[PDB]
DNA sequence: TTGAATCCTTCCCCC
DNA sequence: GGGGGAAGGATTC
């Protein structure tokens, strides 16, 4: 049948950093996100191994991060610049197979199943594309390898990082029963608990219960993409995939409720969205509302025609105003998404 | 305590 | 009964 192999840098951005000034190596690097709202106010994006080590992980505030590591290196984040590292790394992939996939800014699946007899031979292609990215880029990245795109995914989970890892049809069995199933690709804490008080602990376990069990607590969806992974009868292409939205938000100095006081936020997204817009044209508009106590709001609108900067202006004003009016909560992030592109 | 981009489920129109 | 689609909330990486 097919191999998949999955690429995926290791600590990206963090990594990035250390690439653009090498004097960073071997100490600890955690790349933030800053917030104005007050002094070191923020998230940490994500922080490289020896930081980590520690505990200052991704998700974070850098208020908590300051007080265990009080002395290693924060950097604010430049997406941009790892924007362009990631083109570059993911050109060299495209010259192992045209069947590339590009998941995020640091993943992607190739199907070297033609350029490939057997797995051995894999991880030997394996290796030439580590090799080959650290040569022309300098970043170190992990290589999953199995028969379809989520074991290959969990392949590489499992070797982080700066691995590879082969996971061939008897570690695939082994796995569908040994193998946590909060572990698996797409399920967030979120439904790996509603799957804990269902006994489903294990990828096999959704065997067990009937389907129409499953369809109503997780979802019709989740539950054939776990049933078909369970009975080894999972099998997605892998399919170039397009941006199908874009947007942009901001974190507000402070919490408000007045239109007037939220606009100028609210133009900032909308004026930086169609930058990265470059030359999309969107027909639908949605306006986000984070409200104070971390909760998401948002209201759109999609018309039959693409919409100009300056009605998507003009658009926003009524979403947001339509928000303050539904909702009573002040707001705490503001911002935009631009989809359904002409 | 920082974004971004893609699903899950109502719901309203109408053959 | 169900094709076709827009809205707002849910969930994931
Ligand atoms: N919780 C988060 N908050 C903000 N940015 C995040 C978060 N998680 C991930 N990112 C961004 C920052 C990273 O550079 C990139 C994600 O990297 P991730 O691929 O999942 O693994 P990584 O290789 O950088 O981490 P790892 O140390 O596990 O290998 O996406
Ligand atoms: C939205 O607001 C916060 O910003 C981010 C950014 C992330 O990745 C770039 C992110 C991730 C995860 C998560 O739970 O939260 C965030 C958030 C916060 C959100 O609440 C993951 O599991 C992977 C990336
Ligand atoms: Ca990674
Ligand atoms: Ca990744
Ligand atoms: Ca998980």
Redesign the pocket.
Known sequence: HMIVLFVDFDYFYAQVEEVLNPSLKGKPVVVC???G?FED?????TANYEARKFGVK??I???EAKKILPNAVYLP?R?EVYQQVSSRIMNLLREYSEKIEI??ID?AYLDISDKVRDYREAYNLGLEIKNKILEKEKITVTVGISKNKVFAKIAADMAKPNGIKVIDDEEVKRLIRELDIAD?????????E?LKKLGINKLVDTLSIEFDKL??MI????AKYLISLARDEYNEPIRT???????????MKRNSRNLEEIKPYLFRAIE?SYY?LDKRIPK?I?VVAVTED?????????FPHGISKETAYSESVK?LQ?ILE?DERKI??I?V?F??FI
Do not use: C, Q
Request: proline share 3%; charged share 30%; no cysteine.
């Open positions: 996100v800053f917030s709202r106010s923020g998230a940490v994006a991704a998700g505030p850098i208020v984040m997406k998941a995020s993943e698996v690709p797409g399920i967030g804490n979120i439904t790996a509603k369809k109503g979802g019709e969806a989740k995939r397009v941006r199908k939205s874009i947007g942009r938000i901001v974190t930086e990265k639908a949605h971390l909760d998401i709001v948002s209201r759109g609108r999609t979403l339509k539904e705490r992030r911002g998404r989809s359904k």
